[PDB]
Write a protein that binds this ligand. Structure first.
Ligand code: NI
Lengths: 56, 56
């Protein structure tokens, strides 16, 4: 299902949409996306939006 | 499966194990647990242990 992640970092801004199976898959997938492109921070999650964000 | 919650709060420390259906309902049980018992802070998640943390 549709899960979204907002990469609100220093240099880069972003919004990614995926169709992962659940909160579990979407979560690890986004931990790895943010890590691979160099934004790491605290993760916020709204379950009304199915939207993760990571803020630096 | 057994999901865990590490409550790192100013005064209170805690560790809860529950048997919620998935990462989703465990995380919401832990969200409404955290406010219901009055800890507000930053959440990190370990997928090796099935273990949430909130550090106030
Ligand atoms: Ni999560």
């Amino acid at each position: 299902m549709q899960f979204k992640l907002i990469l609100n970092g220093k240099t880069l801004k972003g919004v990614i949409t995926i169709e992962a199976v659940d909160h579990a898959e979407a979560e690890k997938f986004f931990k790895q996306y943010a890590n691979d492109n160099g934004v790491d921070g605290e993760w916020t999650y709204d379950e009304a939006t199915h939207t993760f964000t990571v803020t630096e």
